[model samples]
Target: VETFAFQAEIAQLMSLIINTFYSNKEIFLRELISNSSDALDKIRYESLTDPSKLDSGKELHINLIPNKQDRTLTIVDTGIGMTKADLINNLGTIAKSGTKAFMEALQAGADISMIGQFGVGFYSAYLVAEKVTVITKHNDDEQYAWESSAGGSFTVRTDTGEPMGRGTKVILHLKEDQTEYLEERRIKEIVKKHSQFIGYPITLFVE
Candidate 1:
């Protein structure tokens, strides 16, 4: 699942501040958490009739685990995951018309968060993380790992170590200067500031 064009992900930044809206860097974590919430939203809706898809009935939750030793931040959630095509399409550039569609959604005055769940949401990882690893499992497909430097290309491969059963894990390898994101208080501040409406609880993992 690799062919690329889209160096993209989004947050509520105003006017591409600084070097393309990155001045409001807090939105990156917000955006990623929101996307995880969206996945939970999708899977929660589907779970009304079927419950087995939740990886042994695991409750819906988001885990924000920061590893200072490895300089990685992991976001994990029990939610609907992606397929191979979904993974490949994620890296592909979003259609120009999507901006127009986003306007339409915005104009509709409803839950306009769909734009974030649309893969573009994940691209915001590049803001503070130079590399990202996305491990996901859809009940209909095998578990997979998607990796990228947010460079020219990305790779997707089956993760044979263990079955995710259902969910996604987004691991961000923080940039050398972005270690600030590894602090629990700062991470907590970002989550609370932006994603107070998330349907599921977001827990900070410390060990």
Candidate 2:
């Protein structure tokens, strides 16, 4: 197990994103689904060059599992899962240019359209959740979990639970005010608005 602090710049960026989007918080769903699609795209592209990258050709899809009792909403995708290093480097820092571009755009107008324009889109999860946990498995790497509360630090560790195949699962520990996201009706409503025609099947499991 290992823990690391978010890069100074990314820490600042996260706070800005969370505070700016709190009112229109549904955008976090769109941003997360957008990220899942990108990961799916990557795996698809890789499979073309190397068939083995796709483990027995598992169907490409996304699953939204909401546990009302636990107050968590999980988004799972059959895509290119991250390695430990990826967990750190990718989540801990944003590209310098993207940061500059995002900051400039934020200053002019806090436009909703600018949410996913930069690498920091994932941080938007903090708008609705007090914590986020990502458990992922790569075809070439062992399963690993990454977690953060949008504090200054995050943790990453090897996972020894049941095999998760090659994909990523993002669990949002929803805040009390954000429990509305745990509703199936709300999930369908949001999907229709932002990801109705996305390439992969997005299934919602409610309990």
Candidate 3:
């Protein structure tokens, strides 16, 4: 496992953001699946120039697995997966957040109309998850497991079990107060609300 330190200011800012920003806690799933779509868009855009870059043949999709027994919800996607460096940069820190840049650009008088943005919304996951586990396998790197408790500490390690194809699976260990996320109807409502216009299909399974 690998551990990294978070800047003091950044950690404080993140804590404040997570604690205050997400008024509607269920929005986390919407944000996660939206980020998944962004990843798929990245791969699809690359594939346009190089057909060989296509990884998964199936149409882009999001799958939600809710385990009532464990009080967890697993969000899976067949989108482009993240490498270790990606996990570090994308999750552990916010160096290239498009949303941040988008706001900056807007402040700089850049047109916000065409800005395709992602990230930022990921922090919403902390609203429900006491801990989060991410199992990801990139097309070019080994599968890895990343775990975080949203309090400025996270661990990443090589996954030892069955290999994952090119995709990511995020398991949110729901807090006792956020058990509503475990309902299929709730998940479906959230997905359809924020992602009904998405170019891919989204499925929810609750048990």
Candidate 4:
């Protein structure tokens, strides 16, 4: 298991993102779904050049699983997963150049559009969840888990559980005040409102 401190800029940017979008917390779902869609697209494009990339044979789709007992909401995507390095770079840093660009734009009174390129969308997870866990497996890399609380740092470690095949699973440990996200009806409504036109099918686990 390896733990890393989010760079100084990343910590500050995370705070800014969470506070900026606090009122419209539902957008977090929208951002996450959009990311999954992008990941699916990546794998699809890669498979065209390397047929074996799809050897896992998993259909490209998204799954929302809300667990009341566990107080967790999970988003699973059969998309191109990340390697350990990707997780660190994507989830940890804001990309050296992007950090300065976004900061300057924000200073100039720019809005979310300026930060969009920074992948600050993922930081929105902290708006409703106290902790987040990501388990992912890429075709070219072994499976790994990344965990964080948006506090100051995150941890990445080998995933020892059952094989996840190929893709990513994000588990959001819902905050006490944010339990509303655990409702199936609520999640469905969010999807319909924000992601109805998304090309891939998004399904909710029911039991």
Clashes of each: 2, 0, 0, 0
Clashes of 2: 0
lDDT of 4: 0.83
lDDT of 4 by residue, 82-198 (tens): 998888876455355566677778867776543556566776777788899999999889999999887678999999988988999989999898988998888888998988998
Q: Could you tell me how far off, in angstroms, the CA of residue 35 lies in candidate 4 after the best superposition?
A: 0.8
Model 1: which residue pairs collide?
A: 16-21, 17-21
Best first by lDDT, ranked: 2, 4, 3, 1
Better of 1 and 2 by TM-score: 2
The lDDT for every candidate, in the order shown, is 0.72, 0.83, 0.73, 0.83
Q: What ranking emerges by TM-score with the best candidate at the front?
A: 2, 4, 3, 1
Q: In model 1, which range of ten residues has the least summed lDDT?
A: 9-18
Tens digits of per-residue lDDT, candidate 2, 130-192, equal 999999998878899888888688898899877788889999999988899999999889999
Give the lowest summed-lDDT range of ten residues in model 3: 110-119
TM-score of 1: 0.78
| Model 3 regions lying over 4 Å from their true place | 55-59, 90-118
Winning model by lDDT = 2
What range of 10 consecutive residues in model 2 has the weakest lDDT sum?
Answer: 90-99
Please report how far candidate 1 places residue 200 from its true position, in Å: 0.7
Candidate 3: tens digits of C-alpha lDDT, residues 1-207: 898665554355347545654455666777788888888787777778877666544466778899999888998887888999878765545634554565466556644232334345665577788888999887778899988786777788999977767788999999988888988788778877877887777777758
Residue pairs in clash, model 4: none
